[model samples]
Target: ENIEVHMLNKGAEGAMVFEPAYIKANPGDTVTFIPVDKGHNVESIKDMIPEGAEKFKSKINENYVLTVTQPGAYLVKCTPHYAMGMIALIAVGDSPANLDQIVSAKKPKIVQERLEKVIASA
Candidate 1:
């Protein structure tokens, strides 16, 4: 099936966020990233996707269609709010091969903080 994720300038958590910060789906599923506002883009953080998985980045004002072909965590973020807490975790299956790497990576304080929350739900 498919899921729609909204990129917002200000959401329930505050400054910026993907409405549903965490997503859990199986391989073959699809995800649609929407620009609910003009301040977000869906960009996968380098080294944060499952091994062998492809990288992705949506255009500033474009809607992105992501078909999950790999199984693991795909860490996504908004470039403009990289320091202000604009991030989401899309887990496309049970085995998140790079979870440990991201959990320990030295990212911005807010990013790491939100990342923890996302992983917890997965």
Candidate 2:
């Protein structure tokens, strides 16, 4: 199955943000990230993806489709706006198997803070 995720604008000045900041998908499920604003692209966090999972990067304003082949969590970010907390989390299967690994990975303070807050409530 395939699900659509939107990259949207936030705030009065239109900052970039992912609409559903967190997602839970089953293995083999695909998520298509559609950019609804400019200067937004989807890229996997190097240290936070599941083992054996391939990373994905998209061109600005282009649609990126990711096929979930592993059972774990994937932390995605927008390179240009990561400091602004432009991030998203995708968990394959019912629960995130790599939650601990992701938490321990090195990331910018702002990115880590936002991820931690989201993961805590997830």
Candidate 3:
């Protein structure tokens, strides 16, 4: 499995910043985000999923292991800073592994469930 870890500052300074802003990851690749400070969290909010993919949305670290089964573009954002427009976008399938398939669709409720799991786990 490929790995890409990123760092961000989410201190209680009333603002958070995602370094690099946007990133790209492969289908089998894993993107790990390490927060350098506190009061900050990462949410995979980019309505990313394959068309009619049983509608599954993954919340922040819900599985403690975010797996990208499907190939598509996903957006990860900061909740507290979102109102302030703090967010990061990811294009997952930009260069997907030839061994996988790619598709795109939106599933709000499923996404929310995953979202809730993220915060609830927090």
Candidate 4:
């Protein structure tokens, strides 16, 4: 199946956020990230990704598509607003193969917090 994730500056005055921050899909699924506003880009966390998966990132406001072929969770973040907790999670198959490593990986405090929340829900 194909999934679409929206990158938005959502709020009364536009707060950086990703709509539907958590997604579940199977291997061979395609995810397309769409920027709803300027100054947003999609980027994958290298060490936070599934084994055998390639890292992906997009230019500001540029649309990007990713095809996941592994059964693990993928972590994606927005470069310009990472500090504001602009991040998302993609769960392929069941859960991430390296969930422990990803949760334990040294990352910004906010990022780690968000990852923990999303992972818990996944």
Where in model 4 is the C-alpha error above 4 Å? 11-14
Write the number of the candidate with greater TM-score, choosing between 1 and 4. 1
Write candidate 2's Cα lDDT for 1-122 as tens digits.
88888887784324667867788888899999988877899999897898999988999889999889998899999878887888889999766778888888888787787788777777
lDDT of 4: 0.81
lDDT of each candidate versus the true structure: 0.85, 0.83, 0.46, 0.81
Residue 45 error for model 1, in Å? 0.3
Residue 45 error, candidate 2, Å:
1.0
User: How many residue pairs in model 1 have overlapping backbones?
Assistant: 0
RMSD of each predicted structure: 1.2, 2.3, 10.0, 2.3
Ordering by lDDT: 1, 2, 4, 3
Q: Tens digits of per-residue lDDT for model 4 on 4-112?
A: 9888888422367777778888988988888987889988887888878888888998888889898887778999898887888888887467877877888778877
TM-score of 2: 0.88
Give me the overall lDDT of model 3: 0.46
Whichever of 2 and 3 has more lDDT, that candidate is 2
Query: TM-scores across all candidates?
Result: 0.93, 0.88, 0.53, 0.88
Tell me the deviation in Å of residue 7 in model 1.
0.5
The candidate maximizing TM-score is 1
